[PDB]
Symmetry: C3
Subunit: 147 residues, 3 copies
């Protein structure tokens, strides 16, 4: 049936969603580069729009990674609508915990992802991502640290 394809597609898209978060947190360039079409546009509001795997690597190396000593994104609430068998609009929520290099300050971030995915010759990648930051909160007098 076409349901098996749609379930295989959901699984694939949940992996792209997770990979993006994992790649950034664990600093894995290859993982990060592999999730984007060449013409894909990743936008972080307040930062800019970056195009394809190279753009993704630019943003990571030049902004995201220098910005944080370390961080963790917790991805939830991934909700897909299949426009067709081969294109999906996604929404998702993330909770980001980390330490800003600047001020060496523990923050909590809450952000919304507005995504588009596309299958091309049997393969799903991101076609678009917009990231909007709703909460950006320096945690008063707590500092995240290992045990």
């Amino acid at each position: 049936m076409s349901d098996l394809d749609r379930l295989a597609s959901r699984a694939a898209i949940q992996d792209l969603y997770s990979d993006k978060l994992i790649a950034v947190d664990k600093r894995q360039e290859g993982r990060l580069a592999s999730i984007w079409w060449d013409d894909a546009e990743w936008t972080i509001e307040g930062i800019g729009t970056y195009k394809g795997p190279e753009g993704a690597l630019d943003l990571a190396n030049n902004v995201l990674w220098p910005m944080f000593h370390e961080c963790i994104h917790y991805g939830t609430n991934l909700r897909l609508e299949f426009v067709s068998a081969d294109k999906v609009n996604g929404i998702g929520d993330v909770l980001l915990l980390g330490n800003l290099v600047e001020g060496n300050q523990s923050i909590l971030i809450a952000a919304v992802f507005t995504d588009e995915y596309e299958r091309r010759d049997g393969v799903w990648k991101f076609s678009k991502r917009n990231a909007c930051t709703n909460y950006f909160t320096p945690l008063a007098g707590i500092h995240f640290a290992p045990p």
Copy 2:
């Protein structure tokens, strides 16, 4: 196979579970209403029990939305038990961060969902939801705010 049917039903119920949260957080009346049967029953301990889509809109508009400037629900750990092909029990955990209108106070809530889902005519919806809150914590000198409220005094 009822193996595909099981997988396909898990997906729709997952979508039910997320939709509820999104509709509350993004204040989407049409998504909120679409997920309940007429006889479905939504209870929040300490808040009350509401019935059907209209009950859901009633709670949202008159209690939830007025209570917070905004909030966000992070739903995780959805675990399903298929009672029958058209009946499932679910448990789930939620982390809620928000700002209460009363005192413009930032809160963290940890809550458990105890859910029942019902399939009528190929369509899954909530038959029941109980929301039980384990943590309810106003935050210290902490206030959740957009990134630009930084570099203000």
Copy 3:
């Protein structure tokens, strides 16, 4: 195709992933024991390496349950790669919030799971779990409490 098999495998492993957490949080020995193979190795760096459904209970009853009044694990970002059709590797992230008995202290934990899963005779369980904790921080003027404790 056996996509269905891989899809069914993904679903069962996802339940394994969430059961470990639900069992510990809700304090459910029947759930906690049922998710491990008898040769399963569950390691939490900084603690120890326990084996099978029984060492899993040993870790629970004598270490983590006495350690917390209550806790909640939020598990996310579970990513799987299939090594064979019967064994898979997993990674996952977890956000743990809880009250330590020691000091009655509200804490936040951030941790990573490196997991292996094994299918024996049509049944998936944990072949192994590694838990590495990256943040483990007491939260200062904050105490996690039921909403009624807020009143007077």
